[PDB]
């Protein structure tokens, strides 16, 4: 009921290898979250990887903006709950996507105690990360819908828990920085130093500059550059 | 064991009479074993390994040592003591120690290539404890 | 005739690739330009 040509895959789900080998299967395995026949193709993401496959069908994933086998995203890399309830996502995402997803899951013969395959276990010989946290407990359908994620609340509270600015060069100038501070409020004493390519700004009672501390934790992206920010003295040292 | 030929060995099977009986007893002991421990197919590798050992012993007794006659080699091939395609495959210069005949057929692998059993160890990866799933070893 | 033969074969049976990842791949798994 649903054939295609190429999978809508991730960039990490494909693998850390520029040449992989897919294997199309016309009408296999019955899509996880809509129960429809679709075109399953698996591959090997890299050496000693997990032989990843394709779960969520073409219309299933294309409609809801999500990858066919991890349900995170093609545009960002966040879950489908964070990218719906929550912008903040751009500083919340990551480049260089960890290949801790494409690895074999835990050898249950080892967990019981007698993994007979010895060193030849094509599974993975670590200990099972304890059951108690709800990141032992997520499923597919609750993940794929926005309703009830164990991950998305735990990453959504990373989004609200947690001055020497430099990296000026030839893009940042003094008037652009003081007008980007002018929307926050008024100055008391500002300066720009060019031997270290840095700027010093203050505020009446911080606060407004406090959300600048929310704005500039490797996050204030003006003039196409990730600016460098660490703390000032505030101690007359 | 039954012969089903009624030929009575021209040069005599006496030379490799006992080795064939020991190989048949080992094959019967391997086939009489249960499916305990093996996940899906790991118990079927020993019968193919015993068949490959019997074929290599027959090839070393017939071609390498040049002790038995060609009539005895033909009688052993017609009886079942060795394979015909394996003796032709091991006679090539490109391979003389192949794992099994399930890794040489190009239509067996899903990717349309050869298996990992017939691969060079110097050209492969350093860290690899992989074995042939259809043959048993590499 | 080729299209009708393919349609008749489908009715009888019923009754490499180079894709550039130009979506999010910029620095994560660096080197993937043709895949």
């Amino acid at each position: 009921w649903e054939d295609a040509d190429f999978p809508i895959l991730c960039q990490t789900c494909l693998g850390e290898n520029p040449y992989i080998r897919m294997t199309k299967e016309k009408y296999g395995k019955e899509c996880k979250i809509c129960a429809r026949p679709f075109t399953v193709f698996r591959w090997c993401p890299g050496v000693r990887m997990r032989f990843k496959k394709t779960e969520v069908c073409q219309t299933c994933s294309k409609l809801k903006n999500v990858c066919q086998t991890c349900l995170l995203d093609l545009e960002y890399g966040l879950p489908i709950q964070v990218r719906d309830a929550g912008d903040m996502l751009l500083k919340l995402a990551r480049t260089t996507p960890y290949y801790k997803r494409n690895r074999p899951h835990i050898c249950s013969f080892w967990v019981k105690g007698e993994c007979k395959r010895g060193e030849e276990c094509p599974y993975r010989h670590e200990k099972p990360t304890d059951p108690d946290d709800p990141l032992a407990d997520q499923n597919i359908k609750d993940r794929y819908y926005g309703i009830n994620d164990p991950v998305a609340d735990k990453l959504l509270k990373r989004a609200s828990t947690m001055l020497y600015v430099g990296g000026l060069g030839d893009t940042i100038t003094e008037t652009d920085l003081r007008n980007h501070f002018y929307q926050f409020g008024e100055i008391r004493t500002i300066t720009v130093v060019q031997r270290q390519q840095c700027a010093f700004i203050q505020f009446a009672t911080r606060q407004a500059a406090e959300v600048a501390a929310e704005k500039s934790f490797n996050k204030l992206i003006v003039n196409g550059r990730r600016l460098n920010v660490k703390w000032g003295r505030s101690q007359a040292a | 064991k039954v012969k089903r030929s009624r030929k009575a060995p021209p040069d005599g099977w006496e030379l490799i009479e006992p080795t064939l009986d020991e190989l048949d007893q080992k094959m019967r002991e391997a086939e009489t074993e249960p499916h305990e421990g093996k996940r899906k197919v790991e118990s079927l590798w020993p019968i193919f390994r015993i068949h490959h050992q019997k074929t290599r012993y027959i090839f070393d007794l017939f071609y390498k040592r040049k002790a038995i006659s060609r009539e005895l080699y033909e009688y052993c091939i017609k009886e079942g003591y060795a394979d015909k395609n394996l003796i032709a495959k091991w006679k090539k210069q490109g391979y003389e120690n192949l794992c099994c005949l399930r890794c040489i057929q190009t239509r067996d692998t899903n990717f349309g290539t050869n298996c990992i059993c017939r691969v060079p160890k110097s050209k492969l990866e350093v860290g690899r404890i992989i074995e042939c799933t259809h043959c048993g070893c590499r | 005739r080729v299209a009708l033969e393919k349609s008749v074969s489908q009715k009888v049976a019923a009754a490499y690739i180079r894709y550039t990842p130009s979506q999010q791949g910029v620095a994560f798994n660096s080197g993937a330009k043709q895949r």
């Binding site: 040509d5 520029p18 | 290539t113 492969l124 | 490499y16 180079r18 130009s22």
Partner: peptide
């Protein structure tokens, strides 16, 4: 953006192994 190709089998697999 995906498209077909008609690429060298041997060198594809060789670079993969490498």
């Amino acid at each position: 953006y995906a498209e077909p190709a008609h690429i060298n089998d041997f060198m594809f697999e060789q670079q993969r192994r490498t």
